Amino acid sequence: DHPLDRPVWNSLGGPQSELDVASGNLRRLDPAYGPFAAAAPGAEAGLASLLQGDADEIWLVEPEPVAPPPGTRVIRVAPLLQMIADGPVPSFDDPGIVALGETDVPEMTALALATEPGPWASGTWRYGQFYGVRIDGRLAAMAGERMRPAPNLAEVSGVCTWPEYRGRGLAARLIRKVIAGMAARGEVPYLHSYASNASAIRLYESLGFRARRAMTATLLGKST
C-alpha cells in the first residue's frame, strides 16, 4: 500500500524512527512531539498498553476508525480528507515570512494552545521547520512540518493564526513557504483536513493540493 495510508505507522518506522518510544508491534511518537500511535495489523490489543494514567490518550491516523480494544474507549472520531501536492510549486518570494526557532517557542506555544493547529506538545516545534509572520512585533501566524511517512513525503501542519490577524491571507502565505522548502528538497507535501472543513479544502486546492483519499483520526483513552 501507499506510505500515506498509514502515516503514523510509516513515519515512525521510516524517516522518523528515532521519534518512536515503543517497541515491537507498537509505535508511539515521543510524547514531547505529539500524541500519535499505531499498531501492527492484528496487534491492536497492545494499544491499551500505551495508556496508563487515567487521563492518557493517543491519536491514531488510519484509513478507517480504530476499534477500542479492551482497556480503552473512543473519545473522538474525526473524518479526514488527505491531500497531496505532487504538481510543481510556483515560486513565490515572500520576505515577510520568517523562520522560527527556539527563541519563538513561548509565543508559538501561546498561539498553538489558543487556536486549532492540531496537537501541540512541549517539543512539537522540533518536528521540523516552522515559519511565522510578525505583526506589531507579535507572532501573528505560523505553519510547519510534521510527519514523514517516507523520505520523499512531508506533512504540512501547525497552520494557525490569532483571530485578530485572520482574514489577511497569512495562512496561505505560510503554507507556500513551507511547501517551497519541501520542494527544494525534492519532497512531496501532503496534509490532512477535517472532511467537514469545506473552506480549508478550497484553500488547499488553490495552493496545489489535490484530494488523495479519505482517512480517519481516532482518539482513544482508558476505559472507565
Side-chain angles (χ1 to χ4, degrees), residues 2-27:
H2 200 287
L4 297 185
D5 292 343
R6 300 198 68 204
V8 178
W9 181 256
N10 287 333
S11 63
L12 295 175
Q16 288 158 335
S17 65
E18 280 191 34
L19 307 183
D20 180 10
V21 294
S23 56
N25 274 343
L26 294 174
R27 297 175 189 169

Side-chain angles (χ1 to χ4, degrees), residues 44 48 77-78 106 112 121 133-135 153 155 157 169 175 189 195-196 213 217-218 220-221:
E44 300 88 5
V77 196
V133 184
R134 296 214 162 243
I135 294 182
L153 297 163
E155 192 183 23
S157 199
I175 294 159
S196 74
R213 65 168 307 166
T218 296
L220 299 177

